[PDB]
Amino acid sequence: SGIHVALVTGGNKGIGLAIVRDLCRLFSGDVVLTARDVTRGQAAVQQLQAEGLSPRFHQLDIDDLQSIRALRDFLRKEYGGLDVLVNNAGIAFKVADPTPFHIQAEVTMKTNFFGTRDVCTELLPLIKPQGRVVNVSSIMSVRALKSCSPELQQKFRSETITEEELVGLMNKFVEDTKKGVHQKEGWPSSAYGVTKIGVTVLSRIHARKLSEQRKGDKILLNACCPGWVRTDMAGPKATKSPEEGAETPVYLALLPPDAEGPHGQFVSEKRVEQW
Ligand SMILES: NC(=O)c1ccc[n+]([C@@H]2O[C@H](COP(=O)([O-])OP(=O)(O)OC[C@H]3O[C@@H](n4cnc5c(N)ncnc54)[C@H](OP(=O)(O)O)[C@@H]3O)[C@@H](O)[C@H]2O)c1
Numbered sequence: 001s002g003i004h005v006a007l008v009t010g011g012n013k014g015i016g017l018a019i020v021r022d023l024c025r026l027f028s029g030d031v032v033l034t035a036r037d038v039t040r041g042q043a044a045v046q047q048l049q050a051e052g053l054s055p056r057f058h059q060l061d062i063d064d065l066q067s068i069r070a071l072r073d074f075l076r077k078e079y080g081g082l083d084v085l086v087n088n089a090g091i092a093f094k095v096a097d098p099t100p101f102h103i104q105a106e107v108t109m110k111t112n113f114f115g116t117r118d119v120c121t122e123l124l125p126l127i128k129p130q131g132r133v134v135n136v137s138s139i140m141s142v143r144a145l146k147s148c149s150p151e152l153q154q155k156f157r158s159e160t161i162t163e164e165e166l167v168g169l170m171n172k173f174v175e176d177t178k179k180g181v182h183q184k185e186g187w188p189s190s191a192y193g194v195t196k197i198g199v200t201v202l203s204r205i206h207a208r209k210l211s212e213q214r215k216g217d218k219i220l221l222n223a224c225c226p227g228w229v230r231t232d233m234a235g236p237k238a239t240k241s242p243e244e245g246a247e248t249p250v251y252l253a254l255l256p257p258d259a260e261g262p263h264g265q266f267v268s269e270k271r272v273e274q275w
């Protein structure tokens with residue numbers, strides 16, 4: 001015991017796998033690969049074992065609170081909590097999918113925003129002093145933000161938005177798309193980008209909370225943009241490999257002890273971007 005733990009959601013493929021890999025290399029202590037599918041998770045653990053690395057495995061579907069809570073119990077029992085969390089897991093419908101737009105909004109939101117949020121609700125209390133939390137968002141959240149009404153821009157830029165208020169903006173977007181009024185209600189047209197506005201802004205909220213509640217515990221929490229990366233979510237035409245895409249999340253997960261930041265930032269290519 002006293003052994004440090006890092007954990008990645010969505011770890012069986014894509015950028016998440018790559019993050020697990022570099023944490024296995026760079027992080028002192030245990031690295032937990034999580035996957036909603038067991039057999040996908042284990043296959044990828046076997047992948048990493050063939051490269052000479054030793055991740056641990058736990059099941060996790062961020063869409064299931066009982067899965068998240070089982071994961072929470074395991075971390076308390078095995079480690080007394082958590083040093084590093086990376087919220088990597090997410091989904092995007094491709095644009096030509098004929099699924100009704102309101103269903104794409106709702107489904108994407110449920111995982112990207114609401115699943116991420118539940119994991120932070122359950123796991124943040126376990127985060128240990130000198131810990132790091134990394135929420136993988138997207139540069140598309142910036143593009144979605146600027147396509148919002150100025151009135152929605154100001155809410156989402158606010159230094160004092162509360163988690164409850166963000167929850168209701170996220171729900172509003174979904175509800176508006178269903179009633180066929182989101183354009184008029186000032187929303188942008190990317191359901192996905194809106195969920196990452198979700199993630200980007202939760203991060204800012206959560207960072208403030210940690211300094212309100214846990215000043216001195218030297219905990220750093222940030223959103224990031226991994227770049228355009230070649231994974232099941234984008235395509236073979238994307239610019240970065242999964243490995244290149246892991247870079248900024250890994251950087252934010254291993255920020256040295258007692259570093260003063262970045263904290264509550266939106267980080268792309270290891271630099272702080274404007275929100
Ligand atoms: N260009 C890009 O690729 C790009 C750009 C910007 C941001 N990002 C962000 O990068 C993060 C990872 O995406 P990726 O590009 O590596 O895509 P990916 O290849 O589709 O992998 C996504 C990972 O998330 C997991 N996931 C989806 N829903 C889940 C759920 N309910 N519970 C647990 N895991 C779930 C997936 O598991 P399954 O194998 O079971 O689906 C998979 O392991 C996502 O947040 C994405 O938004 C990606």
Ligand SMILES: [Cl-]
Binds near residue numbers: 139140226227
């Ligand atoms: Cl990005």
